[PDB]
Amino acid sequence: RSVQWCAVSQPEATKCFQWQRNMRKVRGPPVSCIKRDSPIQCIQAIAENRADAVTLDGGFIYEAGLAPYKLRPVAAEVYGTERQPRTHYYAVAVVKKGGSFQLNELQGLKSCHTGLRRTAGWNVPIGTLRPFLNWTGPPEPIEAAVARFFSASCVPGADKGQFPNLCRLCAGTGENKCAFSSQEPYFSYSGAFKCLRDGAGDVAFIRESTVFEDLSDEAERDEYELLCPDNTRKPVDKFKDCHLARVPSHAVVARSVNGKEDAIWNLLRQAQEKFGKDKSPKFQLFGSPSGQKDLLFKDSAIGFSRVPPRIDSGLYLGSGYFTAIQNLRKSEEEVAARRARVVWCAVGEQELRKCNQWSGLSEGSVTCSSASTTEDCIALVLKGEADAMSLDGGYVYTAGKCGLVPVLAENYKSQQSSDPDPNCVDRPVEGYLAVAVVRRSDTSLTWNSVKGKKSCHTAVDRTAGWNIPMGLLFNQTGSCKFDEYFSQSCAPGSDPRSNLCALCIGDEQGENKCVPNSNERYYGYTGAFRCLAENAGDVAFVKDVTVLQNTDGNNNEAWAKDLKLADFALLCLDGKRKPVTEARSCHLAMAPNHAVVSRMDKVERLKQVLLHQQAKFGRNGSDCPDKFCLFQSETKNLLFNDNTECLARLHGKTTYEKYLGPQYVAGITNLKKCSTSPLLEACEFLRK
Ligand SMILES: O=C([O-])C(=O)[O-]
Ligand SMILES: O=C([O-])C(=O)[O-]
Ligand SMILES: [Fe+3]
Ligand SMILES: [Fe+3]
C-alpha cells in the first residue's frame, strides 16, 4: 500500500513526483503525491485521510496537534553533520554590520520574517520582544502590537487587510504580495534573508544555517552578525553562543490513529539511504532545483530520526516552546497568574477528589490536574500542563531522566531525634525500611525459599515493592524474566494478561484489575499489604510502617479490622525471620523518601506554596483538622503518605542523582536494561 505525501505547492508536487518515479524505479516502497495550497489544508488532507504524511515547522506541528486534527510527529529532520547531527536548530536574529542596535533597540526598525506562526520567524522573536510590545492582550491580536513596534515588516501570511505594516516589505506581486508561499520572494528562511539582504529589512529572523547556505563566500558572510540576547553582537558562527532560542527540528506529522507510521518510517528510511546526502543524482531528497528552496524537506537535512511513540506535539515541542506558543494568546496577567499557581497532578479519582478539596483551601495557589497513571502525570508536568506531584524514589529516577527535579521530600518520624518535631522542614530525611512481610504461621517461608511463591507488590517500578525485591533476585540469576520469579503476583501496572497481575482485584466491581492507581484495591503500600492479609499472596513488599498502621484497630476498614501485628513477620536476608518491630535489623534495603518533583522553572514558587500550605493543612498545622489535613487520606495515602510528618528541605541533593544515590541509581539502571518505559524511551529522545 502506498503512502500519500501532501505537497503544498506545484514545485513540491513536482519533486514528490520525481520522488515518486525513482522509488518504484529503484524498487523501493511507493510514494503517492497530493497537492494542496497549504499546511492547514495539508493538515486536513491527513485527518480525513486524503494524504498520509507532511513535513512541518514547529509552529505547525502545534497547529496540527490540535483537535479536531490531532496529528503527531513520527520522524524528525536531522540537521548538522553525520559526525555531529542534531534534531534541533537555533532561532537567530541576523543583521548586517556597520550599525549597532541590540535586541532592545528594534522598535521602529524594519524586520524580515519567515512567515506567520513559524518558530524562527514569528513565535521565537515575537516572544522575545513581548516586553516591549506594550501588548494589552486579547482581544487585540499581538499582530496589531508588532505592526506598531516595527516601522515596516514582511510577515508572509499576515493579514494585509488588518495588518498592512506587517506586509509592507513583502516583495511579491499583486495577490502574491505577502503570501505564505513561494509566490512571495521573501518567504521562508531564504526570503527573509534576501529581505535583509536587499536592504528591505533591518533584521531577518531565521535559523543559524541560512547565511552559510545561501551565502557562497565566507567573506560575503562577514557583512552579517547576530543580535545576542545579551544585547551584544557576535559573529554568525557564534550561533551556539548567541541565539534567541534552541528548537525542535521540523517533523513529518501523521494521524495518531491509523497513522501508517510503519510505512512512512519505512519509506523514509529507504529513500533516506538511496537518495540521502549525495547518494544519487538521479534524485535528491534534500535538494531542490535552482531558484527553489526547501522542497518537501529542508535542503541539507542529513536524515530522519524516529520519534518514540510516547510523544505528542506537546512533548515533541518541549515545555519551554510549547507553552510559549500558547502564551502568544493570553494577557500578561493571565500568564502571570498561571505562574503563581501550582497545578498538582493527581493519579486517579480519589487522589483527584482530595486535590480539589485542597484546591478550595489553597486560595487559588493550588489547582488540580489528573491522569490514571503516574507516568501520564509526569508527561503533563513535561507539557507544562501540570507541575508537581509527590513520587516514589522509583519515579524520581524516571522523572530525573526526564529533566524534572526533587523540590522537597516527605519527612517521617525519626531515628527518634524526636519529639513531635518543631524543626522538621530543616530536618534531614532518613529513608524507609523496605521489608518483605509474610504471615507468622508460614514458619518455613524464608528469604531463601520465597522465590516461586505468590507475591504482592505495591506497583511495578517503586522502590519498596519492585525495585528492591526484584533487584535482589536479579543480582543472583541475571534473569530478565521478572514474571517467572513468583508463580502469580499482584504487581499493578503490569500486563493484566500476564502472571504479574493474576491475584489483582480491580475495584469493588471487579473492575480496573491490575492498574497502577487506587482503583485497584491491592495497589500501593496498604494494597500490597491487604493482598497478604487476605491470603492472596504469601509475601508482600511494603515498608514496615505499613503493617503497624494497618493492624491493631489502627485500620478500621473491615478487611483490616482484626489483624494483629503478632501474625506478621519480616524475612531477613540472612534466612532468619523476625517480628515486625525488628525491622531495623531485619530489612531488604533502605529506600529513599518520596520527594515532590517539578520542572526547574517552577521550583522557588513551589517551595513557597508548599511551605505555606503545610503550616495550615500539615500534620501539626493550623486548619488541621478543623479544616483539612494535607497528610491524611486515611491509609490510602492519597497524594502524600499519611505518615509524612512534613515536607523537608533538600540539603543539596537536588538532582535525581544526588538525591537517590550512586547505588540506587546504578540499580534502577541495571533493571531498566531488561526493558525501559515508552516514557523513558521518549525522554531519551527529547534529551539528546
Ligand atoms: O522556523 C522558521 O522560522 C521557519 O521554518 O520558517
Ligand atoms: O516503595 C513503594 O513500593 C511505593 O512507594 O509504592
Ligand atoms: Fe522552522
Ligand atoms: Fe515508596
Residue in 61, 118, 124, 293 to alter for ligand 1 test, most ligand atoms within 8 A of Cβ: 118
Distance 524 CA to ligand 2 centre (A): 6
**Cell 499557581 maps to which residue?**
341
Beta strand 85-86 with 72-80 is antiparallel
DSSP secondary structure code for residue 135 in this structure: -
Class of domain 1-88+248-336: alpha beta
654 is in an annotated binding site: no
Class of domain 337-430+592-688: alpha beta
Residues with CB under 6 A from ligand 2: 392, 458-459, 462-465, 524-525, 591
Of ligand 2's atoms, which has the minimum distance to the CA of residue 641? Answer: 5
Non-local CB neighbours of 138 within 8 Å, separated by 6+ positions: 329, 330, 331
CA distance 191 to 114: 7
Nearest CA to ligand 2 atom 1: 464
Q: State which amino acid sits at residue 679.
A: L
Beta strand 72-80 with 251-254 is antiparallel
Q: Is 597 helix (H, G, I), strand (E, B) or coil?
A: strand
Half-sphere exposure of 641 (CA within 13 A, CB side): 25
Q: What is the DSSP string of 377-426?
A: HHHHHHTTS--EEEE-HHHHHHHHHTT-EEEEEEE-S-SS--SS-S--TT
Nearest CA to ligand 1 atom 3: 120
Give the residue numbers annotated as catalytic, written as ranges: 70, 256
C-beta of residue 46 within 8 angstroms of C-beta of residue 254: yes
Phi/psi of residue 256, nearest 5 degrees: -70, -55
Residue in 187, 188, 205 to alter for ligand 1 test, most ligand atoms within 8 A of Cβ: 188
Residue in 113, 193, 206 to alter for ligand 1 test, most ligand atoms within 8 A of Cβ: 206
Q: Which method was it determined by?
A: X-ray
Nearest CA to ligand 1 atom 2: 120
CA distance 224 to 215: 11
587 is in an annotated binding site: no
Q: Does 431-591 carry CATH code 3.40.190.10?
A: yes
CATH for 89-247, among 3.40.50.10540, 3.40.190.10, 3.40.47.10, 3.30.470.20? 3.40.190.10
Q: What angle do CA 354, 360, 364 make, to 5 degrees?
A: 120
Residue 420 burial (CB count, 10 A): 9
Phi/psi of residue 382, nearest 5 degrees: -65, -40
Domain ranges of the chain: 1-88+248-336, 89-247, 337-430+592-688, 431-591
In angstroms, what is the C-alpha Rg of the chain? Answer: 29
Q: What angle do CA 661, 663, 667 make, to 5 degrees?
A: 115
Q: Is 58 helix (H, G, I), strand (E, B) or coil?
A: helix
CA distance 418 to 427: 10
> What are the residue ranges of helices labelled H in 142-200?
142-149, 164-167, 188-197
81 is in an annotated binding site: no
CA distance 300 to 666: 40
C-beta of residue 330 within 8 angstroms of C-beta of residue 137: yes
Resolution (Å) of this entry: 2.4
C-beta of residue 579 within 8 angstroms of C-beta of residue 572: no
Helical (H) or strand (E) element with 22: helix 10-25
Distance 246 CA to ligand 3 centre (A): 11
C-beta of residue 148 within 8 angstroms of C-beta of residue 136: no
C-beta of residue 385 within 8 angstroms of C-beta of residue 378: no
Q: Is it true that the peptide bond before 139 is cis, omega within 30 degrees of 0?
A: yes
Half-sphere exposure of 85 (CA within 13 A, CB side): 14
Nearest CA to ligand 2 atom 5: 392
CA distance 606 to 599: 10
Q: State which amino acid sits at residue 462.
A: R
C-beta of residue 286 within 8 angstroms of C-beta of residue 297: yes
Non-local CB neighbours of 653 within 8 Å, separated by 6+ positions: 406, 659
Q: What angle do CA 240, 400, 308 make, to 5 degrees?
A: 75
Q: What is the DSSP string of 439-504?
A: ETT-TT--GGG-TTS-EEES-TT-IIIIIHHHHHHHHHH----TTSSSSS-B-SSS-TTSGGGTT-
DSSP secondary structure code for residue 574 in this structure: T
421 is in an annotated binding site: no
458 is in an annotated binding site: yes
Distance 616 CA to ligand 2 centre (A): 27
C-beta of residue 307 within 8 angstroms of C-beta of residue 76: yes
Residue 27 burial (CB count, 10 A): 8
Residues within 5 A (CB) of ion ligand 3: 57, 119
Ligand 1 contact via 209 beta carbon (within 6 Å): no
Distance 602 CA to ligand 1 centre (A): 29
Q: Is 170 helix (H, G, I), strand (E, B) or coil?
A: coil
Phi/psi of residue 685, nearest 5 degrees: -60, -45
Non-local CB neighbours of 99 within 8 Å, separated by 6+ positions: none
